[PDB]
Symmetry: C6
Subunit: 30 residues, 6 copies
């Protein structure tokens, strides 16, 4: 269904935001 | 339908966030 | 309708995230 | 209504993402 | 209700994006 | 339900944005 589809794309956005934080943590460490 | 339209725009946001993470690796 | 309004604001968010990616590439050079 | 409330918070998120791009543009310019 | 719950989490995301923009000024 | 699932993923996004803000403050030092 369509609401499940929306939840799955939000899950994808959360994964990429976690990736952004991960790369920034590396930048913070030099 | 409009709910599918919403899912498609969320897909676009996820793609751009992926791009942001990738560009940060070049910093 | 309201659901169309939600899709249009999501389109706006995707556009700004694309701008963010563009500027980060400029910073990395 | 509740769907209008959701649209208004998305509008707020878009404004802040525009702000993020604006500050990054300044960083890119030194 | 659940739609109000969704609006409240969106409010939280907007607050954090505002914080991100502010921290970038210190860079 | 599905609407609760959507709220929970939004909560996850807000948590990651908070992590992003934390790391940017660390970078600025």
């Amino acid at each position: 269904g369509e609401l499940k589809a929306i939840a799955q794309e939000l899950k994808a956005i959360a994964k990429e935001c976690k990736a952004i934080a991960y790369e920034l943590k590396a930048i913070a460490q030099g």
